[PDB]
Amino acid sequence: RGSHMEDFVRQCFNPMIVELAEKAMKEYGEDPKIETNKFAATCTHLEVCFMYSDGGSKHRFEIIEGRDRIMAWTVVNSICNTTGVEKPKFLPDLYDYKENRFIEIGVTRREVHIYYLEKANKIKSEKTHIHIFSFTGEEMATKADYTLDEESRARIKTRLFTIRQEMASRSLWDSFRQSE
Ligand SMILES: COc1cc(CCNC(=O)c2nc(Cc3ccccc3C(F)(F)F)[nH]c(=O)c2O)ccc1O
Ligand SMILES: [Mn+2]
Ligand SMILES: [Mn+2]
């Protein structure tokens, strides 16, 4: 199907990020040409996770998001057997070696409060850190511990708002906001 959203996602995001989002959606049994809003969402989430890992020290983060499910769970099991942190019931996004905790990164189109509430209700181990961003420039982290420096998060919010602006300029932001 000829979707403007698909072409915009391919023009906006990095090709390797697009390939990773495509592989993730195909592994989860979703059509990137049909679920174009979910395609944009997966690309955005991947890019935000990569920018997050880009912040901090060189060996600070172990990246779980992006890998296929089997290898991702393998790295999670290795981290749990190495450090001793409780195994999470759901696949997280990163692991902070400095703070020694799993990080779940979320990107929302609504208020960060509701999104964080749903995520804290989903995750039951509580030991997993949750860091939520929004397309309006807001953020919320567990225990007010935002992990990274202010600049590394500020560039993330800037990129999110740029993506929102481009979506609105292409007249696709309304359906993308209604999709969530
Ligand atoms: C069983 O469902 C889950 C699967 C996973 C492992 C892989 N998916 C993510 O890692 C992840 N997916 C999403 C959005 C999404 C997209 C597809 C299905 C379900 C969901 C969610 F349910 F999350 F809305 N947003 C994240 O930020 C994000 O990290 C983790 C937690 C889950 O509850
Ligand atoms: Mn994830
Ligand atoms: Mn996430």
Side-chain angles (χ1 to χ4, degrees), residues 2-18 20-22 24-30 32 34-68 70-85 88 90-97 99-116 118-121 125 128-149 151-180:
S3 188
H4 191 355
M5 194 39 113
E6 208 219 343
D7 288 333
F8 155 73
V9 173
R10 265 167 221 289
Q11 174 263 345
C12 159
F13 291 95
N14 162 295
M16 139 185 169
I17 277 171
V18 168
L20 268 185
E22 260 171 351
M25 287 169 75
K26 284 195 235 286
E27 162 183 20
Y28 273 74
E30 277 136 8
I34 272 287
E35 314 263 69
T36 55
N37 283 322
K38 214 168 148 114
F39 193 20
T42 300
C43 287
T44 312
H45 177 265
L46 265 152
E47 171 134 39
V48 165
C49 287
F50 289 159
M51 279 169 92
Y52 206 94
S53 68
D54 200 13
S57 315
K58 69 200 157 168
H59 294 169
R60 201 201 160 138
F61 295 122
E62 187 76 56
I63 301 174
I64 319 282
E65 173 67 28
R67 322 186 173 251
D68 42 67
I70 330 296
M71 249 311 280
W73 272 119
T74 302
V75 195
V76 178
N77 280 315
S78 310
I79 297 178
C80 290
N81 279 74
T82 290
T83 74
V85 184
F90 315 79
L91 213 33
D93 301 319
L94 267 74
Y95 183 81
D96 195 345
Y97 281 117
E99 308 275 351
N100 257 306
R101 58 179 177 221
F102 285 107
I103 306 190
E104 167 58 38
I105 286 140
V107 192
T108 184
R109 294 141 252 194
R110 318 159 278 162
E111 261 184 2
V112 315
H113 333 283
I114 331 171
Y115 202 75
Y116 190 117
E118 326 189 311
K119 257 62 148 53
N121 297 336
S125 100
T128 297
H129 218 83
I130 287 155
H131 198 144
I132 305 292
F133 299 87
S134 74
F135 281 93
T136 37
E138 286 118 24
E139 76 181 326
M140 167 178 350
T142 315
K143 274 141 25 145
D145 196 322
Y146 294 90
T147 299
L148 287 179
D149 274 6
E151 304 89 334
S152 308
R153 292 131 58 209
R155 58 184 304 258
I156 284 173
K157 317 177 191 140
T158 295
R159 174 64 161 135
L160 288 190
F161 203 89
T162 301
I163 296 168
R164 151 201 262 250
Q165 270 193 85
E166 294 287 270
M167 269 203 226
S169 147
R170 279 148 186 90
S171 272
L172 325 159
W173 171 251
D174 280 356
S175 170
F176 186 75
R177 199 211 273 247
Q178 301 199 18
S179 89
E180 210 201 312

